[PDB]
Short mmCIF file of C-alpha atoms in Angstrom, two decimals:
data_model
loop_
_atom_site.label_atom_id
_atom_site.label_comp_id
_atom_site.label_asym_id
_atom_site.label_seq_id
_atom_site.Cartn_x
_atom_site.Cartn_y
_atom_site.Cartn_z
CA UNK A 1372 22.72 -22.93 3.44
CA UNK A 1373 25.32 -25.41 3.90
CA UNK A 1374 23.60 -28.70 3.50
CA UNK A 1375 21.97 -26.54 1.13
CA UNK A 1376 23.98 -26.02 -1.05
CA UNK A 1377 25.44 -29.54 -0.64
CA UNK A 1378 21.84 -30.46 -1.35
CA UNK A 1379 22.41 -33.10 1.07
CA UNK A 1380 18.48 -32.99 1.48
CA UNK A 1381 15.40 -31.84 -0.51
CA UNK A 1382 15.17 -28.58 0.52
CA UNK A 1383 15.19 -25.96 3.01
CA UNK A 1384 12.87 -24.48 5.02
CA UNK A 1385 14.54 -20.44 5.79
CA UNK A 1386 13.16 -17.11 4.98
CA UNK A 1387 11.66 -16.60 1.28
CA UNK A 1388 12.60 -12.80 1.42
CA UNK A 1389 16.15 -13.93 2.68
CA UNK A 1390 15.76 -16.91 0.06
CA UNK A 1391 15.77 -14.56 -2.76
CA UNK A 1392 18.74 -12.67 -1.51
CA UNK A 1393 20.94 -15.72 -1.27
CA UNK A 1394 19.66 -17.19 -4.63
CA UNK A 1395 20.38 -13.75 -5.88
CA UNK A 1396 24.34 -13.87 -4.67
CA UNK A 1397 24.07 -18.01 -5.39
CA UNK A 1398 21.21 -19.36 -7.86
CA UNK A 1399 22.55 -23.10 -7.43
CA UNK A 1400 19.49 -23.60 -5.21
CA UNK A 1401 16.03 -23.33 -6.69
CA UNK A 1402 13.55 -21.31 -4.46
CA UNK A 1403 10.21 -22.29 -4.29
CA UNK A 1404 7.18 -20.27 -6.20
CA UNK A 1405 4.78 -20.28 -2.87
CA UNK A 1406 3.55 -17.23 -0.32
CA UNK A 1407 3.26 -17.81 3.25
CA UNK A 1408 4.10 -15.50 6.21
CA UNK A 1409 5.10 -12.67 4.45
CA UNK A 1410 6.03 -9.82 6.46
CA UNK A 1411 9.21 -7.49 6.44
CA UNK A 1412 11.85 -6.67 8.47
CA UNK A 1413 12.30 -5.69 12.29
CA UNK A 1414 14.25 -3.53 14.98
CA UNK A 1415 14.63 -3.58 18.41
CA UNK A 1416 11.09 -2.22 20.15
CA UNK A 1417 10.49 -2.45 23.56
CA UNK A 1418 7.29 -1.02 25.23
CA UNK A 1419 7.58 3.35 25.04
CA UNK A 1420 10.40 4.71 22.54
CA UNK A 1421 10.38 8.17 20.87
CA UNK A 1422 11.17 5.66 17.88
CA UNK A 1423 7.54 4.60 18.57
CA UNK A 1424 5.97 7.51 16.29
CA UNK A 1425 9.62 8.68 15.44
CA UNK A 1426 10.45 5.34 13.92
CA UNK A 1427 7.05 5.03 12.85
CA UNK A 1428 6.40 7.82 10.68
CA UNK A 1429 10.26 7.94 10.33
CA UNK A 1430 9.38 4.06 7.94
CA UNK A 1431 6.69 6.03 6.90
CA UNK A 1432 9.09 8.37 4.88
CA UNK A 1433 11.56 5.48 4.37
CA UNK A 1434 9.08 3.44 1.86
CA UNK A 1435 8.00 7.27 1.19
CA UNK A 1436 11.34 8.37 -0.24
CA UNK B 836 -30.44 6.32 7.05
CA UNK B 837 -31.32 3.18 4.67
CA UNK B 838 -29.49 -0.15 5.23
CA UNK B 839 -27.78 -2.03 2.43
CA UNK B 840 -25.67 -4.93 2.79
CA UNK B 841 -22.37 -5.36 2.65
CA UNK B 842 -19.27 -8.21 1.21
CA UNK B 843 -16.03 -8.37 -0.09
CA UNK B 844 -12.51 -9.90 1.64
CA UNK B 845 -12.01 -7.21 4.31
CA UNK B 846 -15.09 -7.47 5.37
CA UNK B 847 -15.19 -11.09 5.93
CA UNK B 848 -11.81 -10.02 8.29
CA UNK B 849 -13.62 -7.85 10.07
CA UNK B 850 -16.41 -10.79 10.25
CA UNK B 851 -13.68 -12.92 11.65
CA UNK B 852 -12.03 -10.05 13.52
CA UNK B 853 -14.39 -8.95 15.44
CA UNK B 854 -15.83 -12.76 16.12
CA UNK B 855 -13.07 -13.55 18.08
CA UNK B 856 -12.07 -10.06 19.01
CA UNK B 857 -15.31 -9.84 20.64
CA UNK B 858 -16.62 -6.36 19.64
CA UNK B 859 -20.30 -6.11 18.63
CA UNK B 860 -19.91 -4.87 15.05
CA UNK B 861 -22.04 -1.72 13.65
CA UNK B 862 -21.34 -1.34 10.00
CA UNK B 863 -22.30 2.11 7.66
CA UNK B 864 -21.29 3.23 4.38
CA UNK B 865 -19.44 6.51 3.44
CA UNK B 866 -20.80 9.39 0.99
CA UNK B 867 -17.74 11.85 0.33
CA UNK B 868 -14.41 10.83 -0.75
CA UNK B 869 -12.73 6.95 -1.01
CA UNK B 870 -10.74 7.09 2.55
CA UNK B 871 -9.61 11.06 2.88
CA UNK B 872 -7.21 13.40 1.85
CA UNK B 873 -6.44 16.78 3.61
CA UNK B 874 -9.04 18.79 1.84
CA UNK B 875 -8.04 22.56 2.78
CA UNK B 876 -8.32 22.31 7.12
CA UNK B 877 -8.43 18.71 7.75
CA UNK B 878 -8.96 15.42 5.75
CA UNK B 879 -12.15 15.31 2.80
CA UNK B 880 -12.82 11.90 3.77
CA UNK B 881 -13.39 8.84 6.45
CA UNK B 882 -10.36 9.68 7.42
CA UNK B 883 -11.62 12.78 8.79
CA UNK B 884 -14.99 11.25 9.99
CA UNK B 885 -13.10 8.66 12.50
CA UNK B 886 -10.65 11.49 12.87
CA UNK B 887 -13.82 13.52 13.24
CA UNK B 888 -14.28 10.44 15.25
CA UNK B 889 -17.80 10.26 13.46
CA UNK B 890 -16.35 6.66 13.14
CA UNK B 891 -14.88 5.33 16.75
CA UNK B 892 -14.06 2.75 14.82
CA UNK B 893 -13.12 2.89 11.16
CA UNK B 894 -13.76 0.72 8.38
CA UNK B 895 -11.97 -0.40 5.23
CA UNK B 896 -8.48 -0.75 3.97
CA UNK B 897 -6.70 1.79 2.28
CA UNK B 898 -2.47 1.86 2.59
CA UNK B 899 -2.14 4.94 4.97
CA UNK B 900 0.04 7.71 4.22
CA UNK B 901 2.50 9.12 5.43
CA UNK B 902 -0.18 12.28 5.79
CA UNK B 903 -2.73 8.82 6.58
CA UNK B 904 -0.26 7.71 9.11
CA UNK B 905 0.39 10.95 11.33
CA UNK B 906 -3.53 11.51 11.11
CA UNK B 907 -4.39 9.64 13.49
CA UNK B 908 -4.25 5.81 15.34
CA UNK B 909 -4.01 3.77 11.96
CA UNK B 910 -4.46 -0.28 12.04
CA UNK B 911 -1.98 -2.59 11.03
CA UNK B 912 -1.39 -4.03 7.05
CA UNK B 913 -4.16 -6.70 6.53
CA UNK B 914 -2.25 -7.49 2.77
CA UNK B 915 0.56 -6.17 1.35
CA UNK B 916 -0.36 -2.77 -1.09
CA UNK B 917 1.47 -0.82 -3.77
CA UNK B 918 1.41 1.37 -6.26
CA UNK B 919 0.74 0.31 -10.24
CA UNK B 920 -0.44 0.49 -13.50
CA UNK B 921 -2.45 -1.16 -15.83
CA UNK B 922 -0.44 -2.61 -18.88
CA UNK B 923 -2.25 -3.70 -21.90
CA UNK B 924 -1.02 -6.81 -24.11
CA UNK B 925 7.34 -10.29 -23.67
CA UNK B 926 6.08 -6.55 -22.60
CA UNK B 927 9.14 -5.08 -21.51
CA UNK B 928 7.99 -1.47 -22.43
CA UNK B 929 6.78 -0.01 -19.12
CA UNK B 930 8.02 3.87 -19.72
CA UNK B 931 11.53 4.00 -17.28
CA UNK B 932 10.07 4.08 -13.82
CA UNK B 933 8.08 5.03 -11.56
CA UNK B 934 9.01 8.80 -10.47
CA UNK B 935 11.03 8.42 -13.94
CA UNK B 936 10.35 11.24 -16.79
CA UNK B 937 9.24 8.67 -19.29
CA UNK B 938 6.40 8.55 -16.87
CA UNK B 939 6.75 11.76 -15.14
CA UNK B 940 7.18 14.12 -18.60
CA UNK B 941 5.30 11.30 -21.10
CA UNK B 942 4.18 13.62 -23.20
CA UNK B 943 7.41 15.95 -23.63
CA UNK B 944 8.84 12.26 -24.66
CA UNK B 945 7.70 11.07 -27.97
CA UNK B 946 5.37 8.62 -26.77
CA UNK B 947 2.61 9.76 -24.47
CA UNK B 948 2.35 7.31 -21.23
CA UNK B 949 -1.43 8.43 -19.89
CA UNK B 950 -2.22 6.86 -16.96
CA UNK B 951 -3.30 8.07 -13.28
CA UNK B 952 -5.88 8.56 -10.79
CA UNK B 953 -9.22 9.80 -9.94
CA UNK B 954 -9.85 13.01 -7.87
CA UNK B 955 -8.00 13.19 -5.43
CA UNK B 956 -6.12 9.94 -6.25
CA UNK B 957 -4.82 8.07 -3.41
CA UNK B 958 -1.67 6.82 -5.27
CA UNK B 959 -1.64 10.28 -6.80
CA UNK B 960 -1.21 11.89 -3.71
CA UNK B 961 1.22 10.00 -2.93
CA UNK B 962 2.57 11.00 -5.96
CA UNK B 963 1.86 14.85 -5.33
CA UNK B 964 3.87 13.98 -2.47
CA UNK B 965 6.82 11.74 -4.37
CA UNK B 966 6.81 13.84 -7.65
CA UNK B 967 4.86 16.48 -9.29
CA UNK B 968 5.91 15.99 -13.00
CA UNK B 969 3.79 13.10 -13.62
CA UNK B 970 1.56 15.26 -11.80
CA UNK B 971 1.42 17.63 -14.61
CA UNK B 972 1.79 15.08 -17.30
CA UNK B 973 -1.70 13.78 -14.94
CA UNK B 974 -3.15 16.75 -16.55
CA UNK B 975 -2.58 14.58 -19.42
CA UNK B 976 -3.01 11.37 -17.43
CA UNK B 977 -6.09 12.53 -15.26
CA UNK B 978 -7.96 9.58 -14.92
CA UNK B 979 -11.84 9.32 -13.64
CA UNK B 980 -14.10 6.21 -12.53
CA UNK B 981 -12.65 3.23 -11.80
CA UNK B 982 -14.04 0.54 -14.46
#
């Protein structure tokens, strides 16, 4: 964001998602138009969890409500 | 019991999918509802034949519910889906929103805003679940067929 914004090169390679939340605070870089790897957000999962249908279901309701 | 063939983009990923998945693929066709919907017991649809498990392995690609989630072992996205509507031809005039009452009570507002699903609609559910006013101003909105 840095370099970025000190356009010291082209342009940078980061997360589009992320991309439009920093042009959104700071529109002095210029996103780019394209799709590719689009996929959401994450939390820590490791192997059995009650947040496994708990945190399933439980984003289920959270895109629900 | 007649065989008709088959195309479109999620079937070429199960084409793919199976390819390298390496699981010898035995495709059918559906007669009652689009995916399923609890009906009065259990779902009117696919959803209840795999949940039937009339389909071990089940076909197609329909966002599940939160009702399509809990109903059983659901795949992963393929593409990214959402509700809409159709807009005909600037624009700007939507109605407010989505759940909103110049959507939800269109016809108690001036202008009517008609638009829905089919029987049983999906999205509609979904919306029987979110909010029931557009759900009444459905009976209004109550669309049928798809072209």
């Amino acid at each position: 964001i840095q370099a970025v914004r000190d356009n010291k090169l082209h342009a940078f390679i980061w997360d589009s998602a992320v991309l439009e939340f920093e042009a959104s605070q700071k529109c002095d870089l210029v996103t780019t138009g394209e799709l590719f790897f689009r996929s959401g957000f994450g939390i820590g999962m490791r192997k059995d969890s009650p947040w496994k249908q708990q945190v399933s279901l439980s984003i289920l309701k959270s895109h629900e409500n | 019991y007649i065989k008709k063939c088959c195309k479109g983009f999620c079937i070429d990923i199960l084409k793919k999918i199976s390819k390298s998945v390496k699981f010898t693929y035995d495709l059918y066709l559906v007669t009652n509802g689009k995916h399923g919907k609890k009906i009065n017991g259990t779902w009117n649809g696919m959803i209840g034949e795999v949940v039937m498990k009339r389909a071990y392995m089940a076909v197609g690609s329909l966002t599940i519910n939160e009702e399509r989630s809990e109903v059983v072992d659901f795949s992963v996205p393929f593409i990214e889906t959402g509700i809409s509507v159709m807009v005909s031809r600037e624009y700007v005039d939507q109605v407010s929103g989505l759940s909103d009452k110049k959507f939800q009570r269109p016809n108690d507002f001036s202008p009517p805003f008609r638009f829905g699903t089919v029987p049983n609609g999906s999205t509609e559910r979904n919306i029987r679940n979110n909010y029931a006013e557009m759900h009444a101003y459905m009976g209004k909105f109550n669309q049928r067929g798809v072209d």
